[PDB]
Design an enzyme around this catalytic site. Structure first.
Site, PDB file in Angstrom:
ATOM      1  N   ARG C  15       0.680  -0.887  -0.200  1.00 29.19           N
ATOM      2  CA  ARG C  15      -0.195  -0.073  -0.086  1.00 29.19           C
ATOM      3  C   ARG C  15       0.995   1.320  -0.005  1.00 29.19           C
ATOM      4  NH1 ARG C  15      -5.992  -1.118  -0.766  1.00 29.19           N
ATOM      5  NH2 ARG C  15      -6.567  -2.379   0.649  1.00 29.19           N
ATOM      6  N   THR C  79       4.276 -14.209  11.671  1.00 30.47           N
ATOM      7  CA  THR C  79       5.494 -13.319  12.767  1.00 30.47           C
ATOM      8  C   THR C  79       6.143 -14.681  13.641  1.00 30.47           C
ATOM      9  OG1 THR C  79       4.224 -12.270  14.324  1.00 30.47           O
ATOM     10  CG2 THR C  79       4.286 -11.294  12.930  1.00 30.47           C
ATOM     11  N   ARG C 330      28.229  25.747  -1.723  1.00 26.82           N
ATOM     12  CA  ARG C 330      28.078  24.435  -2.463  1.00 26.82           C
ATOM     13  C   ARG C 330      29.510  23.323  -1.161  1.00 26.82           C
ATOM     14  NH1 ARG C 330      28.844  24.375  -8.449  1.00 26.82           N
ATOM     15  NH2 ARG C 330      28.426  22.309  -7.897  1.00 26.82           N
TER      16      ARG C 330
HETATM   17  C1  LIG Z   1       7.975  -4.945   7.866  1.00 24.83           C
HETATM   18  O1  LIG Z   1       7.761  -6.369   8.566  1.00 24.83           O
HETATM   19  C2  LIG Z   1       6.759  -6.768   9.292  1.00 24.83           C
HETATM   20  C3  LIG Z   1       5.887  -5.774  10.591  1.00 24.83           C
HETATM   21  C4  LIG Z   1       5.636  -6.318  11.189  1.00 24.83           C
HETATM   22  N1  LIG Z   1       4.748  -5.277  12.159  1.00 24.83           N
HETATM   23  C5  LIG Z   1       4.172  -5.178  13.170  1.00 24.83           C
HETATM   24  N2  LIG Z   1       3.932  -4.655  14.319  1.00 24.83           N
HETATM   25  C6  LIG Z   1       3.836  -2.940  14.509  1.00 24.83           C
HETATM   26  C7  LIG Z   1       2.792  -2.240  13.382  1.00 24.83           C
HETATM   27  C8  LIG Z   1       1.165  -2.633  15.026  1.00 24.83           C
HETATM   28  C9  LIG Z   1       1.798  -3.951  15.499  1.00 24.83           C
HETATM   29  C10 LIG Z   1       0.865  -3.915  16.643  1.00 24.83           C
HETATM   30  C11 LIG Z   1       0.110  -2.966  16.783  1.00 24.83           C
HETATM   31  N3  LIG Z   1      -0.276  -2.396  15.896  1.00 24.83           N
HETATM   32  C12 LIG Z   1      -1.278  -1.175  16.508  1.00 24.83           C
HETATM   33  C13 LIG Z   1      -0.962  -0.380  17.692  1.00 24.83           C
HETATM   34  C14 LIG Z   1      -2.125  -0.084  18.825  1.00 24.83           C
HETATM   35  C15 LIG Z   1      -1.207  -0.725  18.918  1.00 24.83           C
HETATM   36  C16 LIG Z   1       0.872  -1.816  14.868  1.00 24.83           C
HETATM   37  O2  LIG Z   1       0.361  -0.595  14.698  1.00 24.83           O
HETATM   38  C17 LIG Z   1       3.081  -4.754  15.766  1.00 24.83           C
HETATM   39  N4  LIG Z   1       3.347  -6.393  13.099  1.00 24.83           N
HETATM   40  C18 LIG Z   1       4.190  -7.212  11.887  1.00 24.83           C
HETATM   41  O3  LIG Z   1       2.838  -8.391  12.500  1.00 24.83           O
HETATM   42  C19 LIG Z   1       4.499  -6.998  11.524  1.00 24.83           C
HETATM   43  C20 LIG Z   1       5.665  -8.477   9.887  1.00 24.83           C
HETATM   44  C21 LIG Z   1       6.058  -7.679   9.622  1.00 24.83           C
HETATM   45  O4  LIG Z   1       6.311  -8.877   8.619  1.00 24.83           O
HETATM   46  C22 LIG Z   1       7.419  -9.912   8.954  1.00 24.83           C
HETATM   47  C23 LIG Z   1       7.191 -10.815   9.624  1.00 24.83           C
HETATM   48  C24 LIG Z   1       7.365 -11.960   8.883  1.00 24.83           C
HETATM   49  C25 LIG Z   1       6.464 -11.021   9.092  1.00 24.83           C
END
Ligand SMILES: COc1cc2nc(N3CCc4c(ccn(CC5CC5)c4=O)C3)[nH]c(=O)c2cc1OCC1C=C1
Ligand SMILES: COc1cc2nc(N3CCc4c(ccn(CC5CC5)c4=O)C3)[nH]c(=O)c2cc1OCC1C=C1
Ligand SMILES: COc1cc2nc(N3CCc4c(ccn(CC5CC5)c4=O)C3)[nH]c(=O)c2cc1OCC1C=C1
Lengths: 450, 450, 450
Positions: C15, C79, C330
């Site tokens: 996105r 994850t 510069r």
């Molecule tokens: C960029 O890579 C990733 C970032 C990822 N980041 C997250 N999180 C950050 C964003 C986020 C998470 C949990 C809750 N919230 C909402 C906030 C109120 C609490 C988030 O914004 C957890 N959770 C994921 O499952 C994830 C997977 C990702 O992918 C790699 C892994 C293999 C799946």
């Protein structure tokens, strides 16, 4: 079935304190009334009846090319009287939507929902919920239908707690409008014929009035002064920016971004803070725009970087070009791929060929410059004290030394080299080197003040 | 009856982390304390007693011309002790208003309501409602009078829910102040003589204390650090912008507009985003200011357009002139009607006559230029390596060809024509054409690198 | 005890509509994932396991110098599966913190509280309170411990009113991670191995899970598109500005200020609206930066004023210098104390000695300029049409008259004076005056058009 629109646009707009009529004041560079005409057009309107009055001559000049029926009302006796001026042009079996030229942010999508909900021989009324609905007519629903609009002064205790309110925007068929408009009276404190009264008149005929809530309040908010206009502006700009961000344009700060026209973009475009995009602009993939830039009516190719405080108008820039900072492109500037235009450089009505550089303190006007040229710092194209402004033609692979004046009309052929400090008035041939022979006086032992 | 003011201005302002004393920090270009002095003045104050201490030498230099009584307090023993330093100068039968040099946004209108409400031999106390009143003295009303100010630590459960709070701003007659100030003690956790205690002392004398609510919280908010100062700044700028918008000035974005002084304007003035107006500026009717402009101490005539990124100081511009983009006007620039000043042009202490154009890459200093002149790109007025800087005088209908240096002192009379690339050191007569004779070496078959 | 971090960074970020992988998009000029790596580093992490996948080649090039263990996951199965790829590298008796490369604003201080609360053989779970917690797993506390995370769809009526929510951020010891990760299943609607399930598995083992609330929601908010990224940007910039304001930097408007790197500052520094500070910048005491300036990798000495619309990169400026407006420095520009650089001036890879002035319409490149020189308007250093770019050496107390070209390589010795309009190709000796002898044609009675 068919549809036409009526747009109310006759207001003086006294609290704007302007020589312009109310609806010609702009949002995102476009008159408020023009936003509404455009929305009416994309909605599928067969006719657009523009009710106008105050500042009539200005309305006609500023909107000369609009495909609208000009209905000049000679006296202001209320909105029902205004709409009735257009009524003879209503087809019996088309829908008519009534809109307001001072409420420019009403959307096509909201109006499509309004029209779809209209029951046959009835009215669809656009309403909105307010936290503080004081002053506005409350919507009274019995079952799923609107039976009245009770104004502030008439409402009882419980009716004042109703947050749903009249926006004035409504849709009914043409025959119904002609019928009910003829029955509107002016027996009220203002002595005016109110379009509001159609809801009562429809209910008198056992016709159904259904409410449709607008999703955003700002869609139905009008601007009566420039403070309110600036609020609409900021809301509109924020909405445009958000759309671009969701489409993948990196706008570093959407609160410091202005679009006053249309933007076509590729992928991975970056736009730094305080950039203004005006007219029709097209940006290719991976274009980077630095802070402070103004782009009006320009096409920018893939992989172009525009550095800070560059101003560009009616210009084309090829892929992988580098512009700025402090560059000015005036109408007719056409830069080829892989060009370089630098600080304190002005280019007007000139073409600059592939790989050429114009990097400092230079004016190039009415010129053609070829590929792989080197235009030194301080170079200026100029004219004789005469009548019209003539052309400078520079070929490919030309070196123009710093602080040289090129005096049009003149031609410099391929591969020529021009020394610094030269005045060029005569044509330069292919592979011709031109160097200025200077005479200098040298005085030894000249002591400057201590 | 008469009125005088006392302004508390002695604070160090430790959390500013500055070599300046607290109240000399600016809002809209003006020291906080100066805002308060000005308000006291327009309120009708006969005397203004300025209580100062920390950074005394700086206060005296920065506010040398203020019509105030300088009361230097040598020790900080609380606000009642501070005000008492001024008390010998109070007239018995004048009102005294107490104000704070670190709370600059207090208005004349609020203070007029405060003074009007003061009962004879009593006090009028300015109060304000807070959503979270924690830490501040609660106002306790019995009937329509204030009987106490209960601090956070002393209040019971029900008293903590009171949102009305003490601002410290108060009005009483001079005799009452002299009486009650002498009775203030320092028996509290801080060991200070609090002006707050006057409310209790008035009630001891069966004198009436009445509350007057300030309409806006920001009027009574002080700034103890630069974060809080920036909040006051933004609130103030928003308020100035809103006033201008309601007066009919089109400010495209009031959040990106700064006024640091006074603005006089005509009708239909448009001001684009990121403009700064400093000192005293006067704009005529239909003036348009483009994005990024800075105007300091300037008069701009009717129908002038200033294009983006123009910087103007101590200058006058006649009607229908066109300036910018990237123009710089330095002190003493006087442009007549219908002039044109363009990109990368600097004008300093020079007059430019009607219809004349200076459109690119030019420096004009210490010059007089007449009407309908054409100053070419790259033209520079300069001086010999000497002492003082002399004047260049150009008459009417003069053409100065591009990249010409005019070497002051020199005069060019009416109708003269000067060729491009000329060095002018001697006076040019009426209708005299001066052309530089150049010597050039032309070398055929000069091959540049491939 | 020791600590290592695991950072999840494998997301495509569809996105974003970008050719970049999700976590390489920047906040304050630095990739999101880099913020998280830096936080992990200052937390005391011995190892940082970076789980990556999509856009692998770009991750490696953009983060080539990061001290991390590169764990390339070949399939996205959730994850828990991702973290398990790093698990063989966990030491049994170190803590492991799990962080997310798309949630860059998580702080060291919050994470220190999280780690401190971790009971032995248990988990510390970072949670946060939301006004609208719809869609997110609710935290169920029995006593002071977390017994479950109930997702939206499974929660009953009362559990939906719980505002506390799972952030995914957690800390446990290495042995516990290896144990529980091996027991995570994929029996759910998405068919994925969720790290969330560790909380249930810990409770199965009679191990304690304790909650720690993050103070700021934006610390745990991730960015899935550029709209959300811009929100993080604005929050981050506001936080940086507030810190600087509380430290005593006068930022006139913190909403119009951007820091994209690090800022070292003295006392009484003033920064006007729309300034961008990039890379490593050091400002001395009483430095004033005017509106529109861009400073990237610069050192500015005490008492320097930079006037509006100046752009500076990889440059040093000595105390009491004056730069701008419209100045460009510069890379390699080194200005000594008490220098003056003015409008439409460009300095590149040059040193300018004490007291020297370069005030208009000038390019100085690859030069050394001594002390107390006067470089006139329109002066340009240039080169022959050759190969490499040579150096101009100007001594002390030199006057260079306006619109003179200095043709490198060339040397002008101490005390020399050069007349206006000169072309300098040969070395100038000490106290040598060089004046151009011009030839002019003067034609009397030349009438210009009326
Ligand atoms: C960029 O890579 C990733 C970032 C990822 N980041 C997250 N999180 C950050 C964003 C986020 C998470 C949990 C809750 N919230 C909402 C906030 C109120 C609490 C988030 O914004 C957890 N959770 C994921 O499952 C994830 C997977 C990702 O992918 C790699 C892994 C293999 C799946
Ligand atoms: C500029 O011309 C006109 C615009 C006009 N615009 C409106 N409206 C737009 C602004 C507005 C309307 C209704 C409610 N509200 C409040 C919003 C909460 C719902 C509006 O802002 C209706 N209502 C009018 O009566 C009207 C008359 C106008 O004058 C011409 C017609 C002869 C009178
Ligand atoms: C800069 O000098 C001073 C300013 C001072 N300003 C104030 N006030 C302004 C700021 C302020 C005051 C009271 C309440 N509030 C909170 C607002 C909600 C109501 C204020 O912000 C009173 N109150 C002081 O005690 C004071 C002392 C000052 O020191 C001099 C005097 C000898 C002590």
């Amino acid at each position: 079935k068919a549809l036409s629109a009526v747009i109310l646009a006759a207001g003086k707009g006294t609290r704007m304190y302007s020589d312009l009529p109310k609806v010609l004041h702009t949002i995102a560079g476009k008159p408020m009334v023009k936003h509404v005409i455009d929305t009416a057009h994309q909605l599928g309107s067969e006719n657009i009846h523009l009710i106008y009055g105050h500042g009539g001559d200005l309305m006609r000049t500023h909107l000369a090319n609009e495909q609208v029926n000009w209905v000049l009302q000679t006296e202001q006796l209320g909105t029902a009287h205004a709409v009735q001026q257009a009524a003879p042009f209503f087809k019996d079996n088309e829908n008519i939507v009534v809109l307001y030229g001072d409420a420019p942010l009403i959307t096509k999508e909201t109006l499509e929902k309004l029209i779809e909900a209209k029951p046959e021989n009835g009215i669809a009324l656009l309403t909105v919920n307010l936290d503080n609905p004081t002053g506005y007519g409350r919507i009274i629903r019995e079952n799923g239908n609107v039976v009245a609009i009770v104004e502030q002064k008439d409402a009882n205790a419980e009716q004042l707690n109703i947050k749903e309110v009249n926006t004035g925007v409504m849709v009914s068929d043409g025959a119904s409008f002609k019928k009910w408009l003829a029955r509107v009276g002016n027996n009220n404190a203002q002595g005016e014929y109110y379009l509001t009264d159609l809801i009562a008149l429809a209910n008198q005929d056992n016709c159904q009035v259904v409410a449709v809530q607008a999703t955003d309040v700002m869609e139905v908010e009008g601007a009566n002064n420039r403070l309110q206009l600036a609020a609409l502006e900021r809301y509109f700009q924020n909405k445009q920016a958000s759309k671009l961000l969701l489409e993948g344009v990196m706008i570093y700060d959407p609160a410091r971004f202005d679009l006053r026209g249309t933007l076509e973009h590729g992928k991975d475009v970056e736009i730094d803070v305080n950039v203004i995009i005006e007219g029709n602009v097209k940006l290719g993939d991976r274009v980077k725009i630095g802070t402070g830039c103004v782009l009006k009516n320009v096409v920018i190719g893939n992989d172009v970087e525009i550095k800070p405080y560059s101003v560009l108008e009616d210009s084309i820039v090829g892929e992988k070009a580098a512009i700025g900072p402090f560059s000015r492109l005036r109408p007719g500037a056409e830069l080829a791929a892989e060009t370089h235009v630098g600080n304190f450089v002005e280019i007007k009505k000139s073409t600059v060929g592939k790989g050429s550089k114009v990097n400092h303190l230079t004016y190039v006007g009415d010129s053609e410059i070829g590929s792989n040229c080197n235009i030194g710092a301080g170079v200026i194209t100029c004219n004789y004290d005469g009548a019209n402004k003539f052309k400078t033609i520079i070929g490919d692979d030309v070196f123009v030394g710093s602080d040289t004046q090129l005096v049009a009309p003149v031609k410099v052929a391929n591969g020529a080299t021009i020394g610094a400090g030269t005045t060029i008035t005569r044509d330069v041939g292919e592979n011709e080197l031109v160097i200025t022979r200077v005479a200098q006086r040298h005085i030894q032992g000249w002591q400057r003040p201590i």
